[PDB]
């Protein structure tokens, strides 16, 4: 009469949680995956179809979080549903309450650590050996990433199942706020670096083309003839003499003279402001493509 959700079914749930995505839609993102992961638990805990529909429709609403850090929520929900099955504790809002409570912070702590911290280092380490022709690079990347992922999912799911209703107390202000703060610091650092390096908005207008005085350009018409000319030109360039009579200056040079990556950070802040206005990222991406096309059309980019 206790069911108790034996360890085999928890292992099955953890295995199915690998497919938390796949039914990824724009309306209720990552919800079909949540229901698919919960399917064995719904099968075991509930019978005779009188409440299977209710259990499915309750686990078929909005649920967006990082795929890897979702096992804690999965285990907490498993414990709550198992406790409700034996004890007559119908809530229909406690499980939703904990889902919404763990939706935000867990995603915000999982995205930078996994996608923007562990993945880039593992990829760089694998590519260093891959660029040398050594197959050990991709093999090491695959093995390390999958071992880390599966270990994290299983450990966190078991911990969350153990702390059924004590999850919001055993981790509320201790090593949750510490992990959250450290991950936030590291993610902000790495994300600023990624914004600087991975976003290319290099403009291409010509600010001016001035003519230099007879003390700047190499003057390749009165240069010595033969190997001596190459030597003279090389040391003249090394001294600091301009390579051409005309000193072309562009808008990108003037922008970089302030701080490199100014356009990148400006565009990122504009995207931040647009997102804070509750505008879906699809419109922002399409607009980015549109402004790329237009800026190339008018010569700005």
């Amino acid at each position: 009469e206790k069911i108790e959700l034996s360890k085999r079914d928890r292992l099955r749930v953890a295995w199915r949680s690998t497919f938390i995505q796949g039914s990824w839609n724009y309306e209720r993102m990552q919800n079909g995956g949540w229901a698919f992961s919960m399917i064995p638990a719904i099968k075991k805990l509930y019978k005779t179809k009188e409440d299977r529909s209710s259990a499915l429709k309750r686990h078929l609403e909005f649920f967006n979080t990082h795929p890897y850090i979702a096992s804690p929520i999965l285990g907490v929900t498993l414990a709550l549903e198992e406790e409700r099955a034996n004890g007559a504790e119908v809530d229909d809002v406690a499980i939703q309450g904990v889902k919404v409570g763990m939706m935000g912070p867990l995603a915000g702590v999982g995205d930078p650590v996994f996608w923007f911290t562990i993945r880039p280092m593992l990829g760089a380490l694998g590519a260093s050996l891959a660029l040398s022709g050594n197959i050990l690079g991709p093999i090491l990347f695959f093995v390390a990433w999958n071992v880390i992922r599966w270990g994290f999912m299983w450990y966190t799911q078991e911990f969350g199942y153990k702390a059924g209703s004590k999850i919001t107390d055993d981790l509320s202000g201790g090593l949750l706020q510490d992990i959250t703060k450290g991950a936030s610091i590291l993610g902000m650092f790495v994300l600023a670096a990624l914004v600087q390096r991975w976003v290319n908005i290099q403009f291409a207008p010509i600010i001016s083309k001035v003519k230099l005085d007879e003390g700047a350009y190499i003057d390749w018409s009165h240069l010595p003839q033969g190997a001596q000319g190459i030597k003279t030109a090389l040391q003249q360039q090394q001294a600091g003499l301009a390579l051409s009579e005309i000193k072309v200056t562009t808008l990108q040079n003037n922008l970089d003279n302030l701080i490199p990556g100014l356009a990148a950070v400006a565009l990122t802040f504009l995207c931040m402001w647009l997102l804070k206005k509750k505008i879906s990222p699809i419109i922002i991406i399409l607009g980015l493509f549109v402004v790329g096309i237009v800026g190339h059309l008018i010569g700005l980019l």
Partner: protein, 50 residues
């Protein structure tokens, strides 16, 4: 040999004793340089001022 002084655009030297001023920056480039130097030394402010 030596640049006796540099303004927002260009600099001043002496050629055969005669003073010459050579401009080596566009007006918008000069404004960009002035702004860069001004806002790159703004942190040195905010002090007690005696």
């Amino acid at each position: 040999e030596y640049h006796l002084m540099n303004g927002a655009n260009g600099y001043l030297t002496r050629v055969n004793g005669k003073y010459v001023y050579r401009v080596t920056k566009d007006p918008v480039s000069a404004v960009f340089g002035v702004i860069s130097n001004g806002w790159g030394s703004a942190g040195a402010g905010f002090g007690p001022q005696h």
